[PDB]
Amino acid sequence: MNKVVLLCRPGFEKECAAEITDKAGQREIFGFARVKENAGYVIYECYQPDDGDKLIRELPFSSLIFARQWFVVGELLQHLPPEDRITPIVGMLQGVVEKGGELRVEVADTNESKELLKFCRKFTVPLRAALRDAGVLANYETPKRPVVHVFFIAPGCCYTGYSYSNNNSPFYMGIPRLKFPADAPSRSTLKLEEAFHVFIPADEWDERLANGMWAVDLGACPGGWTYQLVKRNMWVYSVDNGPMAQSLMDTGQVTWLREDGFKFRPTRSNISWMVCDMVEKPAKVAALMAQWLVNGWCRETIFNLKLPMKKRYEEVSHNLAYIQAQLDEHGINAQIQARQLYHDREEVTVHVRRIWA
Amino acid sequence: MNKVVLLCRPGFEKECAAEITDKAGQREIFGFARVKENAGYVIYECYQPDDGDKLIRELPFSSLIFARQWFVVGELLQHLPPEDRITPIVGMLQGVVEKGGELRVEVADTNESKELLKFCRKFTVPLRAALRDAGVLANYETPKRPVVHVFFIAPGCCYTGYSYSNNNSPFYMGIPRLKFPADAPSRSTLKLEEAFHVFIPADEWDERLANGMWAVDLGACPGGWTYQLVKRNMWVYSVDNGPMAQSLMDTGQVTWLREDGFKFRPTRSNISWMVCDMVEKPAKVAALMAQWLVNGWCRETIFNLKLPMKKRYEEVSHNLAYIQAQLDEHGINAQIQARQLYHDREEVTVHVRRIWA
Ligand SMILES: C[S@@+](CC[C@H](N)C(=O)[O-])C[C@H]1O[C@@H](n2cnc3c(N)ncnc32)[C@H](O)[C@@H]1O
Ligand SMILES: C[S@@+](CC[C@H](N)C(=O)[O-])C[C@H]1O[C@@H](n2cnc3c(N)ncnc32)[C@H](O)[C@@H]1O
């Protein structure tokens, strides 16, 4: 199988396509990706017949910025008859996957696929039972078998294939399912919350997003990001000239510092987390983030970088290489990830974990 | 997992070890193999932690001469308590293999493991049921999941691991199960029969060992090899100065040519199969085989090469490279395999399939 599907934000197919061509190219896994404006996905077609499975094994999924999720697929099934919906899909997956761990029937995140989404979520149930009988799915859900994807690009038109659970998005359509909490001060709270789900493996949450940690939130007003930190039982220095929500102040966990996030110097030495959602030039925000990490003012950080109008993939990769250059220059070991989150529009979210010897 | 177990003929551990070190070395999969004189197996210990699974994926199993079978294993389980035999083995395989396709509980092919063999064949049944409940084995047998191996080197001492069904021996202990037929003229009939099982994939038998084919058997007296060809409903020219068994002559399928296999020139142009089990110097037999293939006197061939006293792996590889050199020199495309069959002692059996454009 030579085709790899990447789900992306509608209208970012060109970046998603530029990135995967670039990063697969770097491993001599050559091919091309067409771009269908606003389709909400991109297909990378490898030149070599089995390079598709090589690509989704060896290139780290966490290193792609503009893909929400990916999977290898086979040939496009067209015109699935309403009266015979199961057989053709089973025929495409048999011998392709044996005893898979999970099924996900997905669409592109466009408005035109909204009805089709409802169909897919319900179709999952009877389809899963049938794929079980055929031995394509294990009788029990399993983390350590590939996820089976059936991907509908239009009614009666779908691809079938898979991805490895240790190298993909754990989430449906690459979008964690989050309800907005009415007591949170801003909708942007879901950016940090989503970021927690995307970047920190769920079984490490109690350890890395730990009850009792100090955190700093730069540009905190009115407190959407602070809220997520408070929900984790952290103590927070919220840094802004604007006021913090009273609901947050009442918890007893928030210290409001009336300052400029860009000018703020932490007096404290044991801050675990710094988060920053300040609206400003990407090169400047990146510079600030590098200061924090190089000085060991925080152990981990989540922040946002706004994208330019053109050369978005190139520009944001430049920003990241700046921060990495600053780390190398001072001999500092860190892991860096960036992802255009579902709740990110013309921006990218970044996570950096610094290490001490 | 860095350890790969290779089953071999007892007393050929040094060759088996020389070969795997050489061929894994060629792929920069470095490590070492200790040699326990007559143990009937060899363990290749890779330097890199996960190179074990790389080795049994990427190096073609069909290219090893002195291994009957191989599989990756983990740590040696010692002292399996009679009162608790299942739990420790399940604990070693869980997370290591999920929904495996098949179970094989094997020992080394030594006389000291004869009682242990009987234990292993019976233990398979309750062990398989338990591994199913734990999700280590699928509830149904499957070709397209890895084979799960539990390997006993002494009572209560075993390794656990796996191999890929598309890159291993399909046979238990790498030994196809054959009963000797009383109407066959020689016990050596089982060499050719075993060779058919080892070299020709079972689903290609009716096509490649086809009813109606012409074959030539050089050094045919008294007719053990001829017998296997006759059993496939082939027409056979049995070439020898010694007499063919009357039982064979009565079938109507055997033409006895009173000649020297080394001097014999086929008058016929459409011989599918030539087989040769003539006792003679390996370089000379090889030369004869190269004549047959280069002149297109047969489409496929199975023959035997006797091993020298020392440098057996080196010597027999030399012979094979001679034949390959002769093919290259005349622009001839062929696939070559050689395996020290179970019914081979101080010799190796070879199969060559020639191709026409
Ligand atoms: C888009 S809001 C997001 C706030 C937060 N993420 C939330 O959910 O409530 C960004 C905040 O950063 C603050 N900000 C932007 N630039 C700043 C600067 N240079 N110094 C201090 N605050 C700044 C703004 O006042 C604003 O309150
Ligand atoms: C070890 S026997 C095996 C025969 C056969 N594989 C079977 O199962 O009956 C080898 C045979 O090859 C024959 N042979 C050896 N060298 C030969 C030669 N140079 N010309 C003709 N026959 C030869 C011998 O006479 C002997 O019958």
SS3 string of A276-316?
ECCCCCHHHHHHHHHHHHHCCCCCEEEEEEECCCCCHHHHH
B276: Cα separation from own chain's centroid: 18
* Solving technique: X-ray
For residue A345, the enclosing domain spans 176-357
A224 is in an annotated binding site: yes
Tell whether B134 lies on the interface with A, counting CB pairs under 8 A.
no
Strand partners, A160: A150
Do B191 and B287 sit in the same domain of this protein?
yes
Listed residue (A178, A98, A77) closest to A145, CA to CA = A98
- End residue of a domain, out of B79, B104, B138: B79
CATH code for the domain in which residue A119 is found: 3.30.2300.20
Do A123 and A224 sit in the same domain of this protein?
no
C-alpha–C-alpha distance, residues A132 and A137, integer Å: 5
Whether residue B43 contacts residue B3, with contact meaning beta carbons closer than 8 Å, is answered with yes
C-alpha–C-alpha distance, residues B342 and A268, integer Å: 73
Listed residue (A219, A224, A248) closest to A235, CA to CA = A248
C-alpha–C-alpha distance, residues A308 and A300, integer Å: 26
Considering only the beta carbons, identify the residue of B101, B138, B144 that sits closest to A95: B144
The answer to whether the CB of B304 is under 6 A from ligand 2 is no
Whether residue A315 contacts residue A65, with contact meaning beta carbons closer than 8 Å, is answered with no
Which amino acid does the sequence have at A190? L
What is the secondary structure of A25-60 as a DSSP string?
Answer: HTTT--EEE---TT-SEEEEEESSTTHHHHHHHHS-
Strand partners, A148: A103, A162
User: Where on the phi/psi map is residue B166: left (φ > 0), alpha (ψ -120 to 50), or beta?
Assistant: alpha
Do B209 and B257 sit in the same domain of this protein?
yes
| Strand positions, DSSP E, B288-344 | 300-306, 334-339
Do B90 and B137 sit in the same domain of this protein?
yes
Do B196 and B55 sit in the same domain of this protein?
no
Do B203 and B245 sit in the same domain of this protein?
yes
In angstroms, how far apart are the furthest CA atoms of chain A?
69
| Strand positions, DSSP E, chain B | 3-7, 31-33, 41-46, 69-73, 102-107, 147-154, 157-163, 214-218, 235-239, 254-257, 273-276, 300-306, 334-339, 347-354
CB atoms within 10 A of CB A79: 8
Gap from CA of B260 to ligand 2 centroid (Å): 9
Do B123 and B227 sit in the same domain of this protein?
no
Per annotation, catalytic residue among A122, A281, A306, A310: A306
Dihedrals φ, ψ of B139, to 5°?
-70, -15
Locus of tokens 């990218």 = A348
Listed residue (A125, A128, A123, A163) closest to A143, CA to CA = A163
Q: Which residues, numbered 45 to 104 in chain B, qualify as contacts with chain A under a Cβ-Cβ cut-off of 8 Å?
A: 95, 98-99, 101
CATH code for the domain in which residue A243 is found: 3.40.50.150
In the three-class reduction of DSSP (H, G, I as helix; E, B as strand; rest coil), residue A9 is classed as coil
CA-to-CA separations, A12 to A34, A46, A353, B175, in angstroms, rounded: 13, 21, 27, 57
Do A61 and A73 sit in the same domain of this protein?
yes
CB atoms within 10 A of CB A204: 10
CA-to-CA separations, B106 to A4, A95, A159, B81, in angstroms, rounded: 40, 28, 42, 19
Contact B145/A95, CB-based, under 8 Å? Answer: no
Chain A nearest-CA distance from B213, in A, is 33
Q: Supply the residue whose CA is at minimum distance from atom 20 of ligand 1.
A: A260
CB within 8 Å of B263: residues ≥ 6 apart: none
The answer to whether the CB of B243 is under 6 A from ligand 2 is no
- End residue of a domain, out of B79, B103, B129: B79
Q: Supply the residue whose CA is at minimum distance from atom 5 of ligand 1.
A: A220
In the three-class reduction of DSSP (H, G, I as helix; E, B as strand; rest coil), residue B123 is classed as helix
B260 is in an annotated binding site: yes
Enumerate the residues of chain A whose CB falls inside 8 A of the CB of residue B99. 98-99, 138, 142, 145
Locus of tokens 């040939």 = A75
Residue B50, both tokens: 């996960």
Contact B99/A135, CB-based, under 8 Å? Answer: no
Contact A99/B95, CB-based, under 8 Å? Answer: no
Instruction: Determine the straight-line distance between the first and last CA of chain B, rounded to whole angstroms.
Output: 43
Contact B135/A139, CB-based, under 8 Å? Answer: no
Which amino acid does the sequence have at B95? G
Locus of tokens 């925000």 = A285
In the three-class reduction of DSSP (H, G, I as helix; E, B as strand; rest coil), residue B337 is classed as strand
C-alpha–C-alpha distance, residues B68 and B175, integer Å: 7
**Which residues of B are known to be catalytic?**
306
Q: Could you give the strand order of the β-sheet that contains A214-218, starting from the edge strand earlier in sequence?
A: A254-257, A235-239, A214-218, A273-276, A300-306, A347-354, A334-339
Best A58, A97, A98, A136 member to test B by mutation, with max B CBs in 10 Å, is A98
The count of C-alpha atoms lying within 13 angstroms of the C-alpha of B298, restricted to the half-sphere facing its C-beta, is: 28
Whether the link from the prior residue into B222 is cis, omega within 30° of 0, is: yes
Enumerate the residues of chain B whose CB falls inside 8 A of the CB of residue A101. 98
Dihedrals φ, ψ of B32, to 5°?
-140, 160
Tell whether B140 lies on the interface with A, counting CB pairs under 8 A.
yes
C-alpha–C-alpha distance, residues A191 and A277, integer Å: 9
CB within 8 Å of A47: residues ≥ 6 apart: A2, A30, A31
In the three-class reduction of DSSP (H, G, I as helix; E, B as strand; rest coil), residue A232 is classed as coil
Whether residue B203 contacts residue B181, with contact meaning beta carbons closer than 8 Å, is answered with no
| Strand positions, DSSP E, B189-290 | 214-218, 235-239, 254-257, 273-276
Do B165 and B228 sit in the same domain of this protein?
no
Which 8-state DSSP code applies to residue B140? S
Q: Relative to the alpha carbon of B190, which ligand is closest?
A: 2
The answer to whether the CB of B296 is under 6 A from ligand 2 is no
Which 8-state DSSP code applies to residue B245? P
Strand partners, A103: A148
CA-to-CA separations, B105 to A94, B80, B96, B152, B309, in angstroms, rounded: 29, 15, 17, 7, 33
Do A170 and A181 sit in the same domain of this protein?
no
CATH code for the domain in which residue A73 is found: 3.30.70.2810
- End residue of a domain, out of B46, B79, B112: B79
Contact A140/B142, CB-based, under 8 Å? Answer: no
Dihedral of alpha carbons A310, A313, A314, A318, sign: positive
C-alpha–C-alpha distance, residues B246 and B223, integer Å: 10
Contact A99/B142, CB-based, under 8 Å? Answer: yes
Residue A337, both tokens: 């990830």
Do B267 and B181 sit in the same domain of this protein?
yes
Q: How many structural domains is chain B composed of?
A: 3
Do A137 and A256 sit in the same domain of this protein?
no
Residue B128, both tokens: 């398989």
